[PDB]
Ligand binder design. Sequence first.
Ligand SMILES: CCCCCCCCCCCCOP(=O)([O-])OCC[N+](C)(C)C
Ligand SMILES: CCCCCCCCCCCCOP(=O)([O-])OCC[N+](C)(C)C
Ligand SMILES: CCCCCCCCCCCCOP(=O)([O-])OCC[N+](C)(C)C
Ligand SMILES: CCCCCCCCCCCCOP(=O)([O-])OCC[N+](C)(C)C
Ligand SMILES: CCCCCCCCCCCCOP(=O)([O-])OCC[N+](C)(C)C
Ligand SMILES: CCCCCCCCCCCCOP(=O)([O-])OCC[N+](C)(C)C
Ligand SMILES: CCCCCCCCCCCCOP(=O)([O-])OCC[N+](C)(C)C
Ligand SMILES: CCCCCCCCCCCCOP(=O)([O-])OCC[N+](C)(C)C
Ligand SMILES: CCCCCCCCCCCCOP(=O)([O-])OCC[N+](C)(C)C
Ligand SMILES: CCCCCCCCCCCCOP(=O)([O-])OCC[N+](C)(C)C
Length: 10
Amino acid sequence: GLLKFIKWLL
Ligand SMILES: CCCCCCCCCCCCOP(=O)([O-])OCC[N+](C)(C)C
Ligand SMILES: CCCCCCCCCCCCOP(=O)([O-])OCC[N+](C)(C)C
Ligand SMILES: CCCCCCCCCCCCOP(=O)([O-])OCC[N+](C)(C)C
Ligand SMILES: CCCCCCCCCCCCOP(=O)([O-])OCC[N+](C)(C)C
Ligand SMILES: CCCCCCCCCCCCOP(=O)([O-])OCC[N+](C)(C)C
Ligand SMILES: CCCCCCCCCCCCOP(=O)([O-])OCC[N+](C)(C)C
Ligand SMILES: CCCCCCCCCCCCOP(=O)([O-])OCC[N+](C)(C)C
Ligand SMILES: CCCCCCCCCCCCOP(=O)([O-])OCC[N+](C)(C)C
Ligand SMILES: CCCCCCCCCCCCOP(=O)([O-])OCC[N+](C)(C)C
Ligand SMILES: CCCCCCCCCCCCOP(=O)([O-])OCC[N+](C)(C)C
């Protein structure tokens, strides 16, 4: 979880 949202943010 979580990492996918950060990959979008990046
Ligand atoms: C600054 C913070 C101080 C500490 C406060 C206490 C917070 C404790 C939070 C503990 C949360 C535990 O989540 P979990 O059971 O794995 O739910 C997620 C389940 N899935 C992966 C299936 C979506
Ligand atoms: C704004 C204030 C924020 C404070 C944040 C404090 C965070 C404390 C984190 C404590 C360590 C939690 O490690 P964990 O659940 O085993 O991680 C790995 C999770 N998976 C196994 C699902 C990959
Ligand atoms: C993008 C990733 C998002 C992950 C979100 C994970 C959410 C985990 C939530 C875990 C909540 C389970 O504790 P609860 O029964 O409500 O605890 C009691 C709470 N009080 C002491 C304040 C009454
Ligand atoms: C990036 C985030 C990682 C997860 C960090 C842990 C978050 C834990 C939050 C738990 C908050 C519990 O509060 P409460 O008073 O029982 O509210 C209940 C609110 N609902 C009825 C809408 C569920
Ligand atoms: C404001 C201060 C900010 C400090 C921020 C510190 C960040 C620490 C990050 C610690 C990351 C630990 O990764 P890990 O559990 O081994 O990853 C497992 C990843 N997969 C599930 C994809 C394999
Ligand atoms: C008040 C709310 C503030 C929230 C602040 C959130 C900070 C999040 C920082 C997340 C940093 C994640 O690092 P990472 O790549 O998994 O680290 C492991 C490094 N290697 C890949 C080289 C092993
Ligand atoms: C105890 C520590 C303080 C409380 C921290 C609580 C953090 C909980 C984070 C929960 C994040 C849930 O993401 P969500 O709405 O499903 O994502 C948006 C999805 N769409 C883009 C498709 C609309
Ligand atoms: C008001 C509160 C604001 C809090 C804001 C927190 C933001 C946290 C951002 C965390 C970013 C983590 O980056 P990373 O995974 O190491 O990037 C890797 C990127 N490349 C693969 C291209 C090298
Ligand atoms: C505790 C304080 C919480 C503050 C919460 C602030 C909420 C408002 C965040 C608004 C963020 C807007 O980003 P955006 O232009 O859609 O990003 C797109 C990013 N890429 C171009 C890399 C895809
Ligand atoms: C602090 C400003 C917050 C507001 C940002 C608004 C969205 C702008 C558009 C998205 C910008 C994406 O940048 P990034 O690929 O992650 O850049 C990383 C650059 N360094 C490798 C040099 C650290």
